Amino acid sequence: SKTKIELKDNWYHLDGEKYFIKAIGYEIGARPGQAPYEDERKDELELMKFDLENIKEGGYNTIRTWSQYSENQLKLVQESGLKLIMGIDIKPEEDYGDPEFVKDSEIELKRVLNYAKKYDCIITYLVINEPQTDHIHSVTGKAFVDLMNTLINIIHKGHPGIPVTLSANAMISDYMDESIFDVYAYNCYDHNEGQTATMGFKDYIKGLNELNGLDKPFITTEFGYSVSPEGGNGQYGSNTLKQQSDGLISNYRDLIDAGAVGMCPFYYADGWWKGGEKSDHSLNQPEEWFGFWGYSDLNDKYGTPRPVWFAMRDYMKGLIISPKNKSIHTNTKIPLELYNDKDVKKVVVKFRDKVIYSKNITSEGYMADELTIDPVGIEDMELAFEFYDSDNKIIKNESINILASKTAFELPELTIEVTPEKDLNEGKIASIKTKIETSENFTLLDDLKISYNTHLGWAIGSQASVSISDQLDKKIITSENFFNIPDNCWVVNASAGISVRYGKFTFKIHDQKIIYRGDWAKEVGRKL
């Protein structure tokens, strides 16, 4: 008798009960000295026993991977208690349309499945990681889908039961249809730039989930921050340990708020190989410093935990899935949803230091109820959640800010008209006409931000800060911005957004148009 997994109301279930995937990225054979994709493959049991046990005490219930485990490695997972999201090493840079590569992939995957289908710890297969957009233009979208369909199908027959999705990047693969997959999944990174400066992290991602069709569970497959001594750009690289531990937390909430029902924070331990030399901890190589664990010197096989690890541990102990922070509620009944580890014996919610909800938790896991509020007019509220343990000692505080009311109300809204509208072949030069309907009591602030993200690699393309000082009086704020269209830009994410305040409650308002060049995206691009 083995785990049964079904997805409905957009949640993983595990033998009937909702399961919230509290995962971490993990990669064996990547200690200082090692390169995982270059070295002769070894199981590495002795270190896996150490790591898995750490990841257990670390507060997680799942591990996410990029590369397929052997049978011997699976056994150690299976035994651990931990769930697995297993990546299949399909080189992103290969010609997906090359028959030889397809055949090798079919044969490789089939060999893994032949043993992996006896390990019920596997709760998701990731079919590929970070497929790049120029690449897919070159080898054709047709090739890309046909592969995914081959691979998906093979896994369905080969390991029946188990969701298949891909680890696509939110910031370059926003345009991509994922309806062929059993789950929506994205690698999410918040560098307050391009799309994530316009919409903000929560809404950006949330809007992909909404464009996707809100018909399947949504998970994050990566998110985090590098603590390199130097190097990178903006938030990408060169964060302090404080900033890392604090962004990981600001990521979590924001992504749940976007509606994720599974989380894979990025990377247990550093990997000195990611920056060019397995034996050097390059000081200006961001990729080498993503770990929650860091190695001391070349000789260290173990590492020690950075601050982020203790913060993540503690924060995971009681998750609020609803209400979502920065949610708007035109009602007096607030859906409540928690996932609680076995240590949370009580949960209370306060508003202005008065109790409005108080449930004693009898069993762990998912748990739903309702909160009654009494909002006057339009009322921002910080709801203040408190998780208690057996001795009745608070172990987590977390606050959810809502903007609530008993009746409907207007918000200001921002919409954009983009040139060309439909087909980038229609001109060399683009425009974004932003338009902001203001609303009284709602205060716009600082700077409207514009972004014509041209998808060229990781390059986030043009951006702009437009002051609206001189238009505050007006009901309708307007702004026309131009951009050179690159010849080799295949798709673009035109967006704009501005911050908005009501009392203590701030949120961005924004719009987004994803526009293509000719019909190259006919297959791979999201429909409807």
Ligand X SMILES: OC[C@H]1O[C@@H](O[C@@H]2[C@@H](O)[C@H](O)O[C@H](CO)[C@H]2O)[C@H](O)[C@@H](O)[C@@H]1O
Rounded to a whole number of angstroms, the minimum distance from the CB of residue 182 to ligand X is 20
Report if residue 66 touches ligand X, rule: CB under 6 A: yes
Rounded to a whole number of angstroms, the minimum distance from the CB of residue 287 to ligand X is 6
**What is the C-alpha to C-alpha distance for residues 449 and 134, in angstroms, rounded to an integer?**
26
The CA-CA-CA angle for residues 87, 92, 98, to 5°, reads 115
* Position among 119, 225, 290, 339 found at the interface with ligand X (CB under 6 A): 290
Rounded to a whole number of angstroms, the minimum distance from the CB of residue 85 to ligand X is 13
Residue (of 405, 371, 322) closest to 18 by Cα position: 322
**What is the C-alpha to C-alpha distance for residues 269 and 290, in angstroms, rounded to an integer?**
7
Binding mask 177-216 for ligand X (x = CB under 6 A): ----------x-----------------------------
Rounded to a whole number of angstroms, the minimum distance from the CB of residue 271 to ligand X is 5
Comparison of 271 and 303: residue with beta carbon closer to ligand X: 271
The sign of the dihedral angle between the CA atoms of 362, 363, 369, 373 is: positive
The H-or-E segment that residue 311 falls in is helix 307-316
Comparison of 120 and 222: residue with beta carbon closer to ligand X: 222
Report if residue 27 touches ligand X, rule: CB under 6 A: yes
Rounded to a whole number of angstroms, the minimum distance from the CB of residue 369 to ligand X is 37
Total residues in contact with ligand X, by rule CB under 6 A:
12
Comparison of 151 and 371: residue with beta carbon closer to ligand X: 151
Report if residue 174 touches ligand X, rule: CB under 6 A: no
Q: Are 36 and 273 in contact (CB under 8 A)?
A: yes
Residues in Cβ contact with 353 at an 8 Å cutoff, skipping those fewer than 6 apart: none
**What is the C-alpha to C-alpha distance for residues 184 and 216, in angstroms, rounded to an integer?**
7
Phi, psi for 7 (deg, rounded to 5): -115, 115
Rounded to a whole number of angstroms, the minimum distance from the CB of residue 178 to ligand X is 16
* Position among 68, 165, 169, 512 found at the interface with ligand X (CB under 6 A): 169
- Which tokens hold the place of 67? 């590369």
Q: Which of residues 456-495 bind ligand X (CB under 6 A)?
A: none
Rounded to a whole number of angstroms, the minimum distance from the CB of residue 65 to ligand X is 8
Residues pairing with 511 in the sheet: 496
**What is the C-alpha to C-alpha distance for residues 163 and 391, in angstroms, rounded to an integer?**
40
Comparison of 37 and 482: residue with beta carbon closer to ligand X: 37
Residues in Cβ contact with 333 at an 8 Å cutoff, skipping those fewer than 6 apart: 370, 371, 372
Q: Are 74 and 116 in contact (CB under 8 A)?
A: yes
In DSSP notation, 208-239 reads HHHHHTS-S-EEEEE------SS-SBTTBS--
Radius of gyration in angstroms for the set of CA atoms belonging to the chain, rounded to a whole number? 24
- Which tokens hold the place of 60? 């997680």
Q: Which of residues 391-420 bind ligand X (CB under 6 A)?
A: none
Comparison of 19 and 184: residue with beta carbon closer to ligand X: 184
Comparison of 129 and 438: residue with beta carbon closer to ligand X: 129
Binding mask 85-124 for ligand X (x = CB under 6 A): ----------------------------------------
Rounded to a whole number of angstroms, the minimum distance from the CB of residue 188 to ligand X is 9
Comparison of 112 and 418: residue with beta carbon closer to ligand X: 112
Report if residue 130 touches ligand X, rule: CB under 6 A: yes
Rounded to a whole number of angstroms, the minimum distance from the CB of residue 24 to ligand X is 11
Comparison of 245 and 340: residue with beta carbon closer to ligand X: 245
In DSSP notation, 475-504 reads SEEEEEEEEEPPTT--EEEEEEEEEEEETT
Comparison of 27 and 174: residue with beta carbon closer to ligand X: 27
Q: Are 125 and 64 in contact (CB under 8 A)?
A: no
Rounded to a whole number of angstroms, the minimum distance from the CB of residue 413 to ligand X is 32
Q: Are 404 and 374 in contact (CB under 8 A)?
A: no
* Exposed/middle/buried for residue 144 (C-beta within 10 Å: 0-12, 13-18, 19+): buried
Rounded to a whole number of angstroms, the minimum distance from the CB of residue 161 to ligand X is 26
Q: How many CB atoms lie within 10 A of CB 372?
A: 9
Rounded to a whole number of angstroms, the minimum distance from the CB of residue 129 to ligand X is 5
- Which tokens hold the place of 86? 């297993």
Rounded to a whole number of angstroms, the minimum distance from the CB of residue 36 to ligand X is 6
Comparison of 169 and 451: residue with beta carbon closer to ligand X: 169
Rounded to a whole number of angstroms, the minimum distance from the CB of residue 67 to ligand X is 6
| Residue of closest CB approach to ligand X | 66
**What is the C-alpha to C-alpha distance for residues 225 and 292, in angstroms, rounded to an integer?**
10
Residues in Cβ contact with 470 at an 8 Å cutoff, skipping those fewer than 6 apart: none
Residues in Cβ contact with 22 at an 8 Å cutoff, skipping those fewer than 6 apart: 59, 60, 61, 62, 263, 316, 319, 339
Comparison of 247 and 271: residue with beta carbon closer to ligand X: 271
Comparison of 233 and 484: residue with beta carbon closer to ligand X: 233
Comparison of 290 and 387: residue with beta carbon closer to ligand X: 290
| Pairing verdict, β 21-25 and 17-19 | unpaired
- Which tokens hold the place of 200? 């903000």
Q: Residues preceding discontinuities in the chain at C–N > 2.5 Å?
A: none
Of 8-16, 266-274, 316-324, 400-408, the segment contacting ligand X by CB under 6 A is: 266-274
Comparison of 91 and 111: residue with beta carbon closer to ligand X: 91
- Interface positions with ligand X (CB under 6 A): 27, 66, 129-130, 169, 187, 222, 266, 271, 274, 287, 290
